[PDB]
Design an enzyme around this catalytic site. Sequence first.
Site, PDB file in Angstrom:
ATOM      1  N   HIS A  62      -4.187   8.963  -0.534  1.00  0.00           N
ATOM      2  CA  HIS A  62      -4.804   8.101  -0.332  1.00  0.00           C
ATOM      3  C   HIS A  62      -4.500   7.351   1.178  1.00  0.00           C
ATOM      4  O   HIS A  62      -5.085   6.444   1.889  1.00  0.00           O
ATOM      5  CB  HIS A  62      -4.782   6.900  -1.591  1.00  0.00           C
ATOM      6  N   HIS A  92       2.888   1.563   4.784  1.00  0.00           N
ATOM      7  CA  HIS A  92       1.701   2.353   4.943  1.00  0.00           C
ATOM      8  C   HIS A  92       0.714   1.787   5.644  1.00  0.00           C
ATOM      9  O   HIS A  92       0.714   0.606   6.000  1.00  0.00           O
ATOM     10  CB  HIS A  92       1.248   2.876   3.612  1.00  0.00           C
ATOM     11  N   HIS A  94      -3.926   1.521   6.379  1.00  0.00           N
ATOM     12  CA  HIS A  94      -5.288   1.473   5.835  1.00  0.00           C
ATOM     13  C   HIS A  94      -6.010   1.592   7.347  1.00  0.00           C
ATOM     14  O   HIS A  94      -5.696   0.744   8.068  1.00  0.00           O
ATOM     15  CB  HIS A  94      -5.938   0.269   5.178  1.00  0.00           C
ATOM     16  N   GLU A 104      -8.087  -4.171   5.716  1.00  0.00           N
ATOM     17  CA  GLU A 104      -8.362  -4.515   4.430  1.00  0.00           C
ATOM     18  C   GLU A 104      -8.620  -6.002   4.497  1.00  0.00           C
ATOM     19  O   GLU A 104      -9.837  -6.836   4.308  1.00  0.00           O
ATOM     20  CB  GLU A 104      -7.322  -4.216   3.588  1.00  0.00           C
ATOM     21  N   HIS A 117       0.982  -2.283   6.035  1.00  0.00           N
ATOM     22  CA  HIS A 117       1.418  -3.010   5.007  1.00  0.00           C
ATOM     23  C   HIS A 117       2.853  -2.669   4.890  1.00  0.00           C
ATOM     24  O   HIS A 117       3.184  -1.535   4.500  1.00  0.00           O
ATOM     25  CB  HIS A 117       0.668  -2.636   3.600  1.00  0.00           C
ATOM     26  N   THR A 196      -3.909  -3.671  -3.262  1.00  0.00           N
ATOM     27  CA  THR A 196      -5.343  -3.317  -2.827  1.00  0.00           C
ATOM     28  C   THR A 196      -5.801  -2.134  -3.228  1.00  0.00           C
ATOM     29  O   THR A 196      -6.986  -1.700  -2.666  1.00  0.00           O
ATOM     30  CB  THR A 196      -5.432  -3.686  -1.216  1.00  0.00           C
ATOM     31  N   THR A 197      -5.069  -1.254  -3.891  1.00  0.00           N
ATOM     32  CA  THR A 197      -5.421   0.036  -4.644  1.00  0.00           C
ATOM     33  C   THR A 197      -4.918   0.127  -5.995  1.00  0.00           C
ATOM     34  O   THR A 197      -4.217  -0.927  -6.466  1.00  0.00           O
ATOM     35  CB  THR A 197      -4.621   1.074  -3.844  1.00  0.00           C
TER      36      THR A 197
HETATM   37  N1  LIG Z   1      -2.050  -1.931  -0.373  1.00  0.00           N
HETATM   38  S1  LIG Z   1      -0.789  -2.653  -0.844  1.00  0.00           S
HETATM   39  O1  LIG Z   1       0.210  -2.868  -0.110  1.00  0.00           O
HETATM   40  O2  LIG Z   1      -1.569  -3.783  -1.813  1.00  0.00           O
HETATM   41  C1  LIG Z   1      -0.012  -1.600  -2.129  1.00  0.00           C
HETATM   42  C2  LIG Z   1      -0.951  -0.957  -3.126  1.00  0.00           C
HETATM   43  C3  LIG Z   1      -0.635   0.042  -4.083  1.00  0.00           C
HETATM   44  C4  LIG Z   1       0.955   0.114  -4.242  1.00  0.00           C
HETATM   45  N2  LIG Z   1       1.303   1.078  -5.158  1.00  0.00           N
HETATM   46  C5  LIG Z   1       2.640   1.108  -5.733  1.00  0.00           C
HETATM   47  O3  LIG Z   1       3.657   1.764  -4.306  1.00  0.00           O
HETATM   48  C6  LIG Z   1       4.963   1.835  -4.928  1.00  0.00           C
HETATM   49  C7  LIG Z   1       5.923   2.107  -3.847  1.00  0.00           C
HETATM   50  O4  LIG Z   1       5.164   3.039  -3.028  1.00  0.00           O
HETATM   51  C8  LIG Z   1       5.079   2.826  -6.030  1.00  0.00           C
HETATM   52  O5  LIG Z   1       6.552   2.860  -6.349  1.00  0.00           O
HETATM   53  C9  LIG Z   1       4.286   2.398  -7.082  1.00  0.00           C
HETATM   54  O6  LIG Z   1       4.228   3.370  -8.333  1.00  0.00           O
HETATM   55  C10 LIG Z   1       2.729   2.566  -6.833  1.00  0.00           C
HETATM   56  O7  LIG Z   1       2.117   1.729  -7.801  1.00  0.00           O
HETATM   57  C11 LIG Z   1       1.853  -0.452  -3.256  1.00  0.00           C
HETATM   58  C12 LIG Z   1       1.449  -1.285  -2.458  1.00  0.00           C
HETATM   59 ZN   LIG Z   2      -1.805  -1.113   1.651  1.00  0.00          ZN
END
Ligand SMILES: NS(=O)(=O)c1ccc(N[C@@H]2O[C@H](CO)[C@@H](O)[C@H](O)[C@H]2O)cc1
Ligand SMILES: [Zn+2]
Length: 257
Positions: A62, A92, A94, A104, A117, A196-197
Amino acid sequence: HHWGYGKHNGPEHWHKDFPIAKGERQSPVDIDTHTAKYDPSLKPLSVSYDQATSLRILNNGHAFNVEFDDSQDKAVLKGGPLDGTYRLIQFHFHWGSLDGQGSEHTVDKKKYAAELHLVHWNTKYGDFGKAVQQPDGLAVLGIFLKVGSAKPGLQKVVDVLDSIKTKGKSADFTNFDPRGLLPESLDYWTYPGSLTTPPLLECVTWIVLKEPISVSSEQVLKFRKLNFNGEGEPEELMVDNWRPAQPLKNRQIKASF
Ligand SMILES: NS(=O)(=O)c1ccc(N[C@@H]2O[C@H](CO)[C@@H](O)[C@H](O)[C@H]2O)cc1
Ligand SMILES: [Zn+2]
Ligand SMILES: [Cl-]
């Protein structure tokens, strides 16, 4: 039929497996600069990444996560609207298929080419898993990316992408300093939101910097060469992996400036 960013598994479909997608504090949101209000109760924001220890970079299908060793208080975020210490676990991005879209959060409906992010969890909760069971478990520092001059500090990330082109691939990525991805100013907007995911958990205190960083067209073009698909499968370029703005509902966005 896993969630994604396609026509049949994209953002408009997420609510079926994740009902919270239509929740009361979903992210991202449009930041209406004129409606945002300066908040004097906000304390100075503190970004301490001097001892940050990166370990690996992963294409999760993703986006790609630059992971950090969060077993100790090294890279932390505190101050601002935050109560306590939040530890950096990964960052990471987007991005879009074109420079005109990709972020986003939006500013007065304006979309940036990408959004960084930096994810942190509240140390009072022990770990990320426990943190996402709390209203104040996470803090994500969002930084907009615009296309122009190259961002030198981003190049090491860009150059390792060829080794993690497909879903599931990872590569050693030590000694990367995230301080090289920060703009000059820490002026920001903040509001209570969510991931956001999927799982779209509503445990995030969002801190979105006003000043975007500039990256080159070449750098973002390489982001667009990544794949959503796994190795040996038909190529699906990893682009437009952003969720659109969600209803602000009963929320107020505060400004640090
Ligand atoms: N786009 S975000 O920054 O809102 C965002 C979206 C999804 C996650 N997911 C989580 O990210 C963590 C760190 O990668 C994992 O440990 C966890 O299992 C996973 O649900 C993190 C930040
Ligand atoms: Zn993000
Ligand atoms: Cl597609």
